[PDB]
mmCIF file of N, CA and C in Angstrom:
data_model
loop_
_atom_site.group_PDB
_atom_site.id
_atom_site.type_symbol
_atom_site.label_atom_id
_atom_site.label_comp_id
_atom_site.label_asym_id
_atom_site.label_seq_id
_atom_site.Cartn_x
_atom_site.Cartn_y
_atom_site.Cartn_z
ATOM 1 N N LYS E 6 16.478 -32.067 -19.047
ATOM 2 C CA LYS E 6 16.374 -31.195 -17.685
ATOM 3 C C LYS E 6 18.091 -30.816 -17.568
ATOM 4 N N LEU E 7 18.346 -30.305 -16.489
ATOM 5 C CA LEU E 7 20.002 -29.882 -16.346
ATOM 6 C C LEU E 7 20.412 -30.873 -16.065
ATOM 7 N N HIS E 8 22.026 -30.743 -16.174
ATOM 8 C CA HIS E 8 22.455 -32.061 -15.867
ATOM 9 C C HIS E 8 23.923 -31.680 -14.994
ATOM 10 N N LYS E 9 24.341 -32.555 -13.827
ATOM 11 C CA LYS E 9 25.727 -32.203 -13.550
ATOM 12 C C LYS E 9 26.736 -32.818 -14.445
ATOM 13 N N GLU E 10 27.926 -31.492 -14.200
ATOM 14 C CA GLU E 10 29.177 -32.380 -14.677
ATOM 15 C C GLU E 10 30.505 -32.215 -13.896
ATOM 16 N N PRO E 11 31.107 -32.695 -14.064
ATOM 17 C CA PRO E 11 32.444 -32.947 -12.900
ATOM 18 C C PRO E 11 33.325 -31.369 -13.098
ATOM 19 N N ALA E 12 33.898 -31.028 -12.161
ATOM 20 C CA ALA E 12 34.952 -29.952 -12.362
ATOM 21 C C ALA E 12 35.908 -30.079 -11.169
ATOM 22 N N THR E 13 37.266 -29.488 -11.349
ATOM 23 C CA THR E 13 38.121 -29.502 -10.501
ATOM 24 C C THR E 13 38.442 -28.856 -9.979
ATOM 25 N N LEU E 14 38.924 -27.864 -9.273
ATOM 26 C CA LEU E 14 39.036 -26.756 -8.096
ATOM 27 C C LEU E 14 40.177 -26.256 -8.508
ATOM 28 N N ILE E 15 40.409 -24.940 -8.906
ATOM 29 C CA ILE E 15 41.750 -24.676 -9.357
ATOM 30 C C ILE E 15 41.859 -23.523 -8.211
ATOM 31 N N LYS E 16 40.957 -22.431 -8.134
ATOM 32 C CA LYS E 16 41.004 -21.875 -6.886
ATOM 33 C C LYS E 16 39.967 -21.278 -7.149
ATOM 34 N N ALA E 17 39.371 -20.689 -5.445
ATOM 35 C CA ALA E 17 38.272 -19.701 -5.125
ATOM 36 C C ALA E 17 38.758 -18.476 -5.131
ATOM 37 N N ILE E 18 38.265 -17.298 -5.947
ATOM 38 C CA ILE E 18 38.642 -16.227 -5.761
ATOM 39 C C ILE E 18 37.980 -15.419 -5.381
ATOM 40 N N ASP E 19 36.447 -15.727 -5.134
ATOM 41 C CA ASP E 19 35.805 -14.405 -4.154
ATOM 42 C C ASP E 19 34.429 -15.297 -3.780
ATOM 43 N N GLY E 20 33.353 -14.393 -2.998
ATOM 44 C CA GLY E 20 32.372 -14.900 -2.618
ATOM 45 C C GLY E 20 31.428 -15.210 -3.846
ATOM 46 N N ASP E 21 31.590 -14.647 -4.756
ATOM 47 C CA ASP E 21 30.486 -14.893 -6.449
ATOM 48 C C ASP E 21 31.224 -15.997 -7.459
ATOM 49 N N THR E 22 32.794 -16.114 -6.957
ATOM 50 C CA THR E 22 33.712 -16.482 -8.291
ATOM 51 C C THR E 22 34.545 -17.232 -7.930
ATOM 52 N N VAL E 23 34.649 -18.548 -8.635
ATOM 53 C CA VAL E 23 35.745 -19.788 -8.520
ATOM 54 C C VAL E 23 36.242 -20.008 -9.653
ATOM 55 N N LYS E 24 37.248 -20.453 -9.781
ATOM 56 C CA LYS E 24 37.767 -21.063 -11.104
ATOM 57 C C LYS E 24 38.459 -22.613 -11.039
ATOM 58 N N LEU E 25 37.932 -22.796 -12.227
ATOM 59 C CA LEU E 25 37.949 -24.706 -12.098
ATOM 60 C C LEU E 25 38.355 -25.069 -13.261
ATOM 61 N N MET E 26 38.612 -26.355 -13.257
ATOM 62 C CA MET E 26 39.271 -26.793 -14.429
ATOM 63 C C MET E 26 38.133 -27.681 -14.835
ATOM 64 N N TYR E 27 37.537 -27.293 -16.088
ATOM 65 C CA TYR E 27 36.172 -27.791 -16.876
ATOM 66 C C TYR E 27 36.715 -28.486 -18.033
ATOM 67 N N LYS E 28 36.385 -29.648 -18.150
ATOM 68 C CA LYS E 28 36.573 -30.128 -19.371
ATOM 69 C C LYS E 28 38.135 -30.184 -20.092
ATOM 70 N N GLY E 29 39.155 -29.891 -19.144
ATOM 71 C CA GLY E 29 40.493 -29.895 -19.252
ATOM 72 C C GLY E 29 40.581 -28.680 -19.193
ATOM 73 N N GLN E 30 39.924 -27.565 -19.314
ATOM 74 C CA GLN E 30 40.418 -26.176 -19.592
ATOM 75 C C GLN E 30 40.253 -24.869 -18.401
ATOM 76 N N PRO E 31 41.208 -24.383 -18.012
ATOM 77 C CA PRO E 31 40.932 -23.427 -16.729
ATOM 78 C C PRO E 31 39.876 -22.577 -17.068
ATOM 79 N N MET E 32 38.238 -22.223 -16.244
ATOM 80 C CA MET E 32 37.793 -21.258 -16.561
ATOM 81 C C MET E 32 37.687 -20.938 -15.220
ATOM 82 N N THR E 33 36.821 -19.358 -15.405
ATOM 83 C CA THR E 33 36.168 -18.411 -14.437
ATOM 84 C C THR E 33 34.755 -18.718 -14.103
ATOM 85 N N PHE E 34 34.275 -19.252 -12.843
ATOM 86 C CA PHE E 34 32.557 -19.261 -13.009
ATOM 87 C C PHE E 34 32.233 -18.042 -12.445
ATOM 88 N N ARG E 35 30.661 -17.609 -12.185
ATOM 89 C CA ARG E 35 30.096 -16.715 -11.907
ATOM 90 C C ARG E 35 28.933 -17.495 -11.279
ATOM 91 N N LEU E 36 28.939 -17.586 -9.763
ATOM 92 C CA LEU E 36 28.020 -18.375 -9.094
ATOM 93 C C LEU E 36 26.201 -17.644 -9.705
ATOM 94 N N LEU E 37 25.618 -18.411 -10.237
ATOM 95 C CA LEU E 37 24.203 -18.030 -11.111
ATOM 96 C C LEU E 37 23.405 -17.819 -10.124
ATOM 97 N N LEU E 38 22.528 -16.843 -9.922
ATOM 98 C CA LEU E 38 21.369 -15.956 -9.189
ATOM 99 C C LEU E 38 21.838 -15.286 -7.657
ATOM 100 N N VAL E 39 23.238 -14.959 -7.573
ATOM 101 C CA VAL E 39 23.682 -14.841 -6.199
ATOM 102 C C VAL E 39 24.174 -13.617 -6.168
ATOM 103 N N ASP E 40 23.634 -12.590 -5.328
ATOM 104 C CA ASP E 40 24.640 -11.147 -5.135
ATOM 105 C C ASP E 40 25.727 -11.220 -3.766
ATOM 106 N N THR E 41 26.854 -11.757 -3.589
ATOM 107 C CA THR E 41 27.215 -11.789 -2.314
ATOM 108 C C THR E 41 28.013 -10.263 -2.310
ATOM 109 N N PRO E 42 28.460 -10.206 -0.963
ATOM 110 C CA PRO E 42 29.250 -8.792 -0.817
ATOM 111 C C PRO E 42 30.546 -9.253 -1.177
ATOM 112 N N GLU E 43 31.517 -8.144 -1.642
ATOM 113 C CA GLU E 43 32.841 -8.795 -2.609
ATOM 114 C C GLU E 43 33.871 -8.259 -1.621
ATOM 115 N N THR E 44 35.167 -8.606 -2.275
ATOM 116 C CA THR E 44 36.274 -8.399 -1.274
ATOM 117 C C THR E 44 36.872 -7.612 -2.509
ATOM 118 N N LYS E 45 36.448 -8.234 -3.727
ATOM 119 C CA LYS E 45 36.937 -7.315 -5.073
ATOM 120 C C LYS E 45 36.025 -6.411 -6.343
ATOM 121 N N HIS E 46 35.600 -5.962 -4.977
ATOM 122 C CA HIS E 46 34.276 -4.901 -5.665
ATOM 123 C C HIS E 46 35.004 -3.777 -6.618
ATOM 124 N N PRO E 47 34.527 -3.625 -7.724
ATOM 125 C CA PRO E 47 35.542 -2.918 -8.699
ATOM 126 C C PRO E 47 35.313 -1.477 -8.308
ATOM 127 N N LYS E 48 34.208 -0.860 -7.691
ATOM 128 C CA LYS E 48 34.299 0.356 -7.091
ATOM 129 C C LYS E 48 34.262 0.082 -5.753
ATOM 130 N N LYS E 49 33.750 -0.153 -4.950
ATOM 131 C CA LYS E 49 33.750 -0.418 -3.480
ATOM 132 C C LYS E 49 35.028 -0.676 -3.029
ATOM 133 N N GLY E 50 35.390 -1.861 -3.263
ATOM 134 C CA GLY E 50 36.304 -2.759 -2.854
ATOM 135 C C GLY E 50 36.359 -3.889 -2.078
ATOM 136 N N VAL E 51 36.296 -3.844 -0.844
ATOM 137 C CA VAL E 51 36.089 -4.729 0.587
ATOM 138 C C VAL E 51 34.936 -4.549 1.002
ATOM 139 N N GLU E 52 33.308 -4.777 0.685
ATOM 140 C CA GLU E 52 32.288 -5.048 1.635
ATOM 141 C C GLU E 52 31.981 -5.801 2.802
ATOM 142 N N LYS E 53 31.246 -4.967 3.520
ATOM 143 C CA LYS E 53 30.726 -5.599 5.322
ATOM 144 C C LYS E 53 30.107 -7.098 4.560
ATOM 145 N N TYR E 54 31.040 -8.407 5.252
ATOM 146 C CA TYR E 54 30.362 -9.637 5.118
ATOM 147 C C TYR E 54 31.207 -10.054 3.976
ATOM 148 N N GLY E 55 31.761 -8.898 3.200
ATOM 149 C CA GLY E 55 32.693 -9.959 1.652
ATOM 150 C C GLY E 55 33.881 -10.641 2.442
ATOM 151 N N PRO E 56 34.625 -10.564 3.106
ATOM 152 C CA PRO E 56 35.577 -11.520 3.788
ATOM 153 C C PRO E 56 34.859 -12.588 4.129
ATOM 154 N N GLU E 57 34.101 -12.665 4.671
ATOM 155 C CA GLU E 57 33.018 -14.130 5.436
ATOM 156 C C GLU E 57 32.458 -14.818 4.140
ATOM 157 N N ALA E 58 31.975 -14.317 3.596
ATOM 158 C CA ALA E 58 31.188 -14.481 1.951
ATOM 159 C C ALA E 58 32.202 -15.196 1.306
ATOM 160 N N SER E 59 33.500 -15.130 1.015
ATOM 161 C CA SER E 59 34.447 -15.718 0.621
ATOM 162 C C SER E 59 35.217 -16.724 1.151
ATOM 163 N N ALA E 60 35.241 -16.184 2.744
ATOM 164 C CA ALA E 60 35.954 -17.693 3.143
ATOM 165 C C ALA E 60 35.037 -18.892 3.144
ATOM 166 N N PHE E 61 33.656 -18.800 3.277
ATOM 167 C CA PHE E 61 32.769 -19.853 3.523
ATOM 168 C C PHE E 61 32.784 -20.596 1.794
ATOM 169 N N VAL E 62 32.931 -20.059 0.848
ATOM 170 C CA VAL E 62 32.962 -20.806 -0.350
ATOM 171 C C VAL E 62 34.210 -21.227 -0.898
ATOM 172 N N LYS E 63 35.229 -20.566 0.011
ATOM 173 C CA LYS E 63 36.556 -21.446 0.051
ATOM 174 C C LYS E 63 36.922 -22.553 0.472
ATOM 175 N N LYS E 64 35.917 -22.571 1.841
ATOM 176 C CA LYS E 64 36.169 -23.672 3.062
ATOM 177 C C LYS E 64 35.051 -24.788 2.127
ATOM 178 N N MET E 65 34.005 -24.452 1.725
ATOM 179 C CA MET E 65 33.201 -25.415 0.837
ATOM 180 C C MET E 65 33.757 -26.054 -0.190
ATOM 181 N N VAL E 66 34.582 -25.124 -1.103
ATOM 182 C CA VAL E 66 35.045 -25.970 -1.886
ATOM 183 C C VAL E 66 36.263 -26.790 -2.086
ATOM 184 N N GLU E 67 36.901 -26.056 -1.111
ATOM 185 C CA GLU E 67 38.219 -26.733 -0.744
ATOM 186 C C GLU E 67 38.273 -28.107 0.167
ATOM 187 N N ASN E 68 37.436 -28.397 0.688
ATOM 188 C CA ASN E 68 37.136 -29.360 1.454
ATOM 189 C C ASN E 68 36.250 -30.278 0.592
ATOM 190 N N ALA E 69 35.634 -30.367 -0.303
ATOM 191 C CA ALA E 69 34.961 -31.192 -0.873
ATOM 192 C C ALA E 69 35.762 -32.520 -1.524
ATOM 193 N N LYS E 70 34.629 -33.323 -2.036
ATOM 194 C CA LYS E 70 35.440 -34.657 -2.506
ATOM 195 C C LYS E 70 35.349 -34.414 -3.882
ATOM 196 N N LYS E 71 33.868 -33.909 -4.033
ATOM 197 C CA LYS E 71 33.588 -33.688 -5.681
ATOM 198 C C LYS E 71 32.703 -32.373 -5.750
ATOM 199 N N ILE E 72 33.380 -31.526 -6.675
ATOM 200 C CA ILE E 72 32.421 -30.739 -7.574
ATOM 201 C C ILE E 72 32.163 -30.951 -8.970
ATOM 202 N N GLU E 73 30.777 -30.208 -8.740
ATOM 203 C CA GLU E 73 29.904 -30.656 -10.126
ATOM 204 C C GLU E 73 29.443 -29.114 -10.866
ATOM 205 N N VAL E 74 29.493 -28.637 -11.651
ATOM 206 C CA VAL E 74 29.033 -27.738 -11.843
ATOM 207 C C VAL E 74 27.473 -27.813 -13.094
ATOM 208 N N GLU E 75 26.514 -27.432 -12.970
ATOM 209 C CA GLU E 75 25.593 -27.282 -13.614
ATOM 210 C C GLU E 75 25.005 -25.898 -14.396
ATOM 211 N N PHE E 76 24.993 -25.953 -15.357
ATOM 212 C CA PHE E 76 24.846 -25.074 -16.414
ATOM 213 C C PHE E 76 22.944 -24.543 -16.266
ATOM 214 N N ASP E 77 22.607 -23.456 -16.409
ATOM 215 C CA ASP E 77 21.151 -23.504 -16.728
ATOM 216 C C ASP E 77 20.623 -23.458 -18.149
ATOM 217 N N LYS E 78 19.415 -23.302 -18.762
ATOM 218 C CA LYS E 78 18.723 -23.498 -19.807
ATOM 219 C C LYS E 78 19.177 -21.871 -21.081
ATOM 220 N N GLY E 79 19.651 -21.029 -20.340
ATOM 221 C CA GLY E 79 20.195 -19.946 -21.107
ATOM 222 C C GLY E 79 21.518 -19.938 -21.395
ATOM 223 N N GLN E 80 22.364 -18.358 -21.563
ATOM 224 C CA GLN E 80 23.179 -18.764 -21.678
ATOM 225 C C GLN E 80 24.323 -19.264 -21.088
ATOM 226 N N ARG E 81 25.289 -19.347 -20.973
ATOM 227 C CA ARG E 81 26.468 -19.936 -20.111
ATOM 228 C C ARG E 81 27.583 -19.349 -19.731
ATOM 229 N N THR E 82 27.835 -18.401 -20.545
ATOM 230 C CA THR E 82 28.711 -17.615 -19.907
ATOM 231 C C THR E 82 28.358 -15.785 -20.353
ATOM 232 N N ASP E 83 29.367 -15.202 -19.468
ATOM 233 C CA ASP E 83 28.630 -13.681 -19.259
ATOM 234 C C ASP E 83 29.254 -12.668 -20.318
ATOM 235 N N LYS E 84 29.322 -11.569 -20.329
ATOM 236 C CA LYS E 84 30.076 -10.648 -20.985
ATOM 237 C C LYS E 84 31.885 -10.895 -20.702
ATOM 238 N N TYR E 85 32.192 -10.923 -19.721
ATOM 239 C CA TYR E 85 33.525 -11.242 -19.008
ATOM 240 C C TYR E 85 34.245 -12.442 -19.476
ATOM 241 N N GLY E 86 33.093 -13.785 -19.933
ATOM 242 C CA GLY E 86 33.770 -14.718 -20.488
ATOM 243 C C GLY E 86 33.475 -15.582 -19.206
ATOM 244 N N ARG E 87 32.934 -15.397 -18.176
ATOM 245 C CA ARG E 87 32.556 -16.422 -17.229
ATOM 246 C C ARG E 87 31.635 -17.317 -17.612
ATOM 247 N N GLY E 88 32.112 -18.765 -17.071
ATOM 248 C CA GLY E 88 30.837 -19.625 -16.894
ATOM 249 C C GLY E 88 29.592 -19.184 -16.113
ATOM 250 N N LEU E 89 28.552 -19.206 -16.251
ATOM 251 C CA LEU E 89 27.309 -18.963 -15.317
ATOM 252 C C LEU E 89 26.577 -20.143 -15.211
ATOM 253 N N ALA E 90 26.990 -20.887 -13.643
ATOM 254 C CA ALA E 90 26.220 -22.146 -13.026
ATOM 255 C C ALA E 90 25.939 -21.958 -11.575
ATOM 256 N N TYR E 91 25.309 -23.134 -11.703
ATOM 257 C CA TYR E 91 24.648 -23.472 -10.152
ATOM 258 C C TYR E 91 26.101 -24.610 -9.680
ATOM 259 N N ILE E 92 26.758 -24.272 -8.891
ATOM 260 C CA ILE E 92 28.394 -25.246 -8.477
ATOM 261 C C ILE E 92 28.086 -26.140 -7.188
ATOM 262 N N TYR E 93 28.064 -27.210 -7.424
ATOM 263 C CA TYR E 93 27.781 -28.494 -5.983
ATOM 264 C C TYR E 93 28.961 -28.943 -5.502
ATOM 265 N N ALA E 94 29.576 -28.738 -4.128
ATOM 266 C CA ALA E 94 30.310 -29.532 -3.561
ATOM 267 C C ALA E 94 29.932 -30.627 -2.645
ATOM 268 N N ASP E 95 29.976 -32.249 -2.532
ATOM 269 C CA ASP E 95 29.633 -32.824 -2.591
ATOM 270 C C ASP E 95 28.095 -33.100 -2.173
ATOM 271 N N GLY E 96 27.558 -32.364 -3.443
ATOM 272 C CA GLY E 96 26.239 -32.482 -3.339
ATOM 273 C C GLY E 96 24.883 -31.477 -3.039
ATOM 274 N N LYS E 97 26.459 -30.331 -2.596
ATOM 275 C CA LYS E 97 25.293 -29.261 -1.706
ATOM 276 C C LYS E 97 25.696 -28.528 -2.785
ATOM 277 N N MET E 98 24.689 -27.617 -3.064
ATOM 278 C CA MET E 98 24.621 -26.630 -3.769
ATOM 279 C C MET E 98 25.438 -25.190 -3.217
ATOM 280 N N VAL E 99 26.400 -24.391 -3.338
ATOM 281 C CA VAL E 99 27.071 -23.431 -2.893
ATOM 282 C C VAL E 99 26.383 -22.051 -3.219
ATOM 283 N N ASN E 100 25.805 -22.438 -4.430
ATOM 284 C CA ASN E 100 25.028 -20.946 -4.396
ATOM 285 C C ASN E 100 23.719 -21.059 -3.416
ATOM 286 N N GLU E 101 22.903 -21.878 -3.252
ATOM 287 C CA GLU E 101 22.115 -21.854 -1.724
ATOM 288 C C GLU E 101 22.380 -22.215 -0.575
ATOM 289 N N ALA E 102 23.844 -22.523 -0.577
ATOM 290 C CA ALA E 102 24.219 -22.543 0.887
ATOM 291 C C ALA E 102 24.467 -21.071 1.387
ATOM 292 N N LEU E 103 25.124 -20.258 0.515
ATOM 293 C CA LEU E 103 25.766 -18.447 0.732
ATOM 294 C C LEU E 103 24.255 -17.910 1.216
ATOM 295 N N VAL E 104 22.802 -18.439 0.197
ATOM 296 C CA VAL E 104 21.884 -17.645 0.703
ATOM 297 C C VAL E 104 21.218 -18.097 1.769
ATOM 298 N N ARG E 105 21.411 -19.351 2.213
ATOM 299 C CA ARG E 105 20.753 -19.731 3.088
ATOM 300 C C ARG E 105 21.433 -19.399 4.607
ATOM 301 N N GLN E 106 22.555 -19.123 4.593
ATOM 302 C CA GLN E 106 23.621 -18.847 5.264
ATOM 303 C C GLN E 106 23.552 -17.511 5.928
ATOM 304 N N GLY E 107 22.548 -16.070 4.769
ATOM 305 C CA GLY E 107 22.699 -14.990 5.112
ATOM 306 C C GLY E 107 23.642 -14.366 4.675
ATOM 307 N N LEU E 108 24.874 -14.929 3.567
ATOM 308 C CA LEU E 108 25.845 -14.274 3.340
ATOM 309 C C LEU E 108 25.816 -14.369 1.615
ATOM 310 N N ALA E 109 24.529 -13.786 1.178
ATOM 311 C CA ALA E 109 24.059 -13.515 -0.260
ATOM 312 C C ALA E 109 23.003 -13.229 -0.302
ATOM 313 N N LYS E 110 22.450 -12.268 -1.419
ATOM 314 C CA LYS E 110 20.996 -12.215 -1.899
ATOM 315 C C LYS E 110 20.295 -12.820 -3.111
ATOM 316 N N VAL E 111 19.368 -13.068 -3.477
ATOM 317 C CA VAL E 111 18.957 -13.692 -4.555
ATOM 318 C C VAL E 111 19.157 -12.052 -5.862
ATOM 319 N N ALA E 112 19.917 -12.513 -6.994
ATOM 320 C CA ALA E 112 20.089 -11.495 -7.611
ATOM 321 C C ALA E 112 19.026 -10.807 -8.398
ATOM 322 N N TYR E 113 19.324 -9.945 -9.462
ATOM 323 C CA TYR E 113 17.856 -10.138 -10.310
ATOM 324 C C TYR E 113 18.288 -10.788 -11.326
ATOM 325 N N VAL E 114 17.142 -11.473 -11.731
ATOM 326 C CA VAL E 114 17.267 -12.221 -12.699
ATOM 327 C C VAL E 114 16.600 -12.896 -14.035
ATOM 328 N N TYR E 115 17.321 -13.157 -15.060
ATOM 329 C CA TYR E 115 17.297 -12.903 -16.420
ATOM 330 C C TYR E 115 16.931 -14.569 -17.157
ATOM 331 N N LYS E 116 15.653 -14.554 -17.156
ATOM 332 C CA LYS E 116 15.098 -15.973 -17.953
ATOM 333 C C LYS E 116 16.110 -15.822 -19.332
ATOM 334 N N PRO E 117 15.906 -17.166 -19.508
ATOM 335 C CA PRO E 117 15.433 -18.220 -19.021
ATOM 336 C C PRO E 117 16.523 -18.798 -17.821
ATOM 337 N N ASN E 118 17.637 -17.908 -17.346
ATOM 338 C CA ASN E 118 18.655 -18.614 -16.321
ATOM 339 C C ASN E 118 18.064 -18.641 -15.185
ATOM 340 N N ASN E 119 16.766 -19.126 -14.419
ATOM 341 C CA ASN E 119 16.212 -18.911 -13.426
ATOM 342 C C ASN E 119 15.329 -20.497 -13.091
ATOM 343 N N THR E 120 16.035 -21.189 -13.683
ATOM 344 C CA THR E 120 15.704 -22.527 -12.824
ATOM 345 C C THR E 120 15.448 -22.599 -11.530
ATOM 346 N N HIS E 121 16.143 -22.602 -10.897
ATOM 347 C CA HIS E 121 16.603 -22.668 -9.094
ATOM 348 C C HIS E 121 16.028 -21.457 -8.503
ATOM 349 N N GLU E 122 15.121 -20.120 -9.092
ATOM 350 C CA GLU E 122 14.894 -19.332 -8.521
ATOM 351 C C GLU E 122 14.069 -19.341 -7.040
ATOM 352 N N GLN E 123 13.090 -20.158 -7.579
ATOM 353 C CA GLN E 123 12.222 -20.022 -6.531
ATOM 354 C C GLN E 123 12.667 -20.490 -5.231
ATOM 355 N N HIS E 124 13.560 -21.951 -5.537
ATOM 356 C CA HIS E 124 14.195 -22.566 -4.205
ATOM 357 C C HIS E 124 15.421 -21.933 -3.561
ATOM 358 N N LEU E 125 15.934 -20.704 -4.132
ATOM 359 C CA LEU E 125 16.979 -19.788 -3.537
ATOM 360 C C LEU E 125 15.746 -19.057 -2.742
ATOM 361 N N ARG E 126 15.127 -18.547 -3.077
ATOM 362 C CA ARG E 126 14.340 -17.304 -2.548
ATOM 363 C C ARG E 126 13.285 -17.847 -1.496
ATOM 364 N N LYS E 127 13.245 -19.013 -1.470
ATOM 365 C CA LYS E 127 12.706 -19.551 0.125
ATOM 366 C C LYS E 127 14.027 -19.913 0.871
ATOM 367 N N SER E 128 15.444 -20.270 0.333
ATOM 368 C CA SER E 128 16.104 -19.979 1.654
ATOM 369 C C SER E 128 16.394 -18.732 2.069
ATOM 370 N N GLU E 129 16.070 -17.907 0.810
ATOM 371 C CA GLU E 129 16.622 -16.421 1.379
ATOM 372 C C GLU E 129 15.398 -15.695 2.423
ATOM 373 N N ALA E 130 14.333 -16.285 2.141
ATOM 374 C CA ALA E 130 13.531 -15.669 3.139
ATOM 375 C C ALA E 130 13.400 -16.594 4.466
ATOM 376 N N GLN E 131 13.830 -17.809 4.525
ATOM 377 C CA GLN E 131 14.344 -18.112 5.908
ATOM 378 C C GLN E 131 15.594 -17.639 6.351
ATOM 379 N N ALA E 132 16.480 -17.486 5.636
ATOM 380 C CA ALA E 132 17.994 -16.850 6.426
ATOM 381 C C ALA E 132 17.620 -15.067 6.898
ATOM 382 N N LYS E 133 16.357 -14.733 6.084
ATOM 383 C CA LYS E 133 15.737 -12.846 7.038
ATOM 384 C C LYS E 133 15.268 -13.161 7.966
ATOM 385 N N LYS E 134 14.324 -14.387 7.816
ATOM 386 C CA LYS E 134 13.695 -14.739 9.023
ATOM 387 C C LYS E 134 14.944 -15.157 10.305
ATOM 388 N N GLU E 135 15.470 -16.002 9.665
ATOM 389 C CA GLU E 135 16.664 -15.994 11.228
ATOM 390 C C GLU E 135 17.635 -14.660 11.648
ATOM 391 N N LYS E 136 17.197 -13.726 10.601
ATOM 392 C CA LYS E 136 18.313 -12.446 10.927
ATOM 393 C C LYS E 136 19.677 -12.887 10.990
ATOM 394 N N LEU E 137 19.902 -13.637 10.098
ATOM 395 C CA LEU E 137 21.418 -13.989 10.002
ATOM 396 C C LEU E 137 22.366 -13.338 9.001
ATOM 397 N N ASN E 138 23.736 -12.934 9.488
ATOM 398 C CA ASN E 138 24.624 -12.234 8.849
ATOM 399 C C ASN E 138 24.222 -10.779 8.636
ATOM 400 N N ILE E 139 24.262 -10.760 6.847
ATOM 401 C CA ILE E 139 23.758 -9.751 6.380
ATOM 402 C C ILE E 139 22.127 -9.323 6.548
ATOM 403 N N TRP E 140 21.464 -9.934 7.172
ATOM 404 C CA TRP E 140 19.946 -10.166 7.347
ATOM 405 C C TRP E 140 20.529 -9.318 8.930
ATOM 406 N N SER E 141 21.242 -9.358 9.823
ATOM 407 C CA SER E 141 21.179 -9.272 10.867
ATOM 408 C C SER E 141 21.177 -7.755 11.104
#
């Protein structure tokens, strides 16, 4: 099954990306399965709810006692060299938290990197139902 490994915050970079110290090396991590509005959009620049989504994972990871990373069963890095993972702050999955708050959508999914897909999609259905943020 999947397993969680410890990491240390280096810097939150955007709503969907954080830099961590992982096994003694600085690495950039892309949050698996979520698309967030971005502040660093390659074309768009700063989208609606981008600052808010980015402020939320900053707070969450900067105020955590314990950060853990959980790789999925497929590829662990994307084509830009970023780790592909579920990130946890004190036991709470940052990826699900963003979706639950209406600050991210579930991304297009690539098997077999889809272990928590159903879980995330349920949280997204709920944020939609509650008309939160991006769904308002």
